[PDB]
Amino acid sequence: LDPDPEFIGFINNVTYPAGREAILACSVRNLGKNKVGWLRASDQTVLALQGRVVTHNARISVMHQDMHTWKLKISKLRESDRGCYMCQINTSPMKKQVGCIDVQVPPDIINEESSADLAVQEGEDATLTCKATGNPQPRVTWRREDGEMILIRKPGSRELMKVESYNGSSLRLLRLERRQMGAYLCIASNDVPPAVSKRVSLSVHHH
Ligand SMILES: *[C@@H]1O[C@H](CO[C@@H]2O[C@@H](C)[C@@H](O)[C@@H](O)[C@@H]2O)[C@@H](O[C@@H]2O[C@H](CO)[C@@H](O)[C@H](O)[C@H]2NC(C)=O)[C@H](O)[C@H]1NC(C)=O
């Protein structure tokens, strides 16, 4: 009774920022004549079998540095690499363990959902919006490029109040004065560097 292959540990779920090299580790004992492969769990396509990488994906590699551990390696990690990967032993039936990769992604500003340069007549309201994406979800701050204070609603009231900056995707300017013209900068960050900014130029005329 020299027994069947068995998984020794488990593949821990991992988190990497984009651009790094993701490594998943799979440990098996008593492999014998059987084979260890990796598959992408989404589409069941074979990434590797034994020491051969079967996919044509140039970013995928496998390692086997000691006798009980098999590693899958994904270089230049992308959002599309997110998800679960399966270590499989070709027993009958197959034995499988699953490990999943959470890819942290630095923020993007979705330009086509965000404000372009605009002009308004003095007195109009204008909302400046930066819709940002990323993982974790970014936060957005607004400030004037020239460092001058921004006029926003005084909370609960109908009056306005000066602030150094505003935290939120939509900067809501009310009854604009001509001196509120100029460049507004929205900065999106989620602590996965770099942050990202969009410059929005506001013109205020007579109207
Ligand atoms: C390991 O991760 C899978 C995948 O879930 C994703 O990755 C996690 C690390 C985390 O970021 C989740 O928010 C992601 O959805 C886990 O399976 C998921 O479990 C949740 C809650 O039980 C469920 O809503 C999802 O549908 C599951 N997704 C899949 C693809 O199965 C799994 O539970 C994690 N394992 C351990 C031991 O923590």
Side-chain angles (χ1 to χ4, degrees), residues 15-20 76-83 101-109 132-139 188-196:
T15 305
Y16 287 92
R20 284 282 291 105
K76 304 298 180 166
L77 198 65
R78 292 208 284 273
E79 179 170 349
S80 59
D81 301 316
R82 170 191 317 287
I101 298 169
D102 182 25
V103 180
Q104 285 173 317
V105 185
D108 293 329
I109 290 168
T133 195
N135 182 38
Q137 177 67 25
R139 68 175 198 278
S189 181
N190 61 2
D191 283 324
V192 192
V196 58

Side-chain angles (χ1 to χ4, degrees), residues 24-52:
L24 296 179
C26 182
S27 295
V28 298
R29 79 167 88 269
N30 293 318
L31 187 59
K33 293 300 213 59
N34 292 86
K35 296 169 160 61
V36 183
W38 292 89
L39 282 68
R40 175 141 204 197
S42 67
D43 51 31
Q44 221 74 25
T45 59
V46 176
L47 303 186
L49 179 64
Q50 300 285 75
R52 300 298 290 272

Side-chain angles (χ1 to χ4, degrees), residues 46-76:
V46 176
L47 303 186
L49 179 64
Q50 300 285 75
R52 300 298 290 272
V53 176
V54 169
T55 180
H56 298 142
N57 186 340
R59 289 179 307 112
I60 284 193
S61 307
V62 285
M63 298 177 286
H64 179 46
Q65 291 162 314
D66 56 81
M67 86 184 322
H68 293 304
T69 311
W70 281 255
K71 292 169 184 196
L72 175 69
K73 179 161 65 180
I74 308 178
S75 288
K76 304 298 180 166

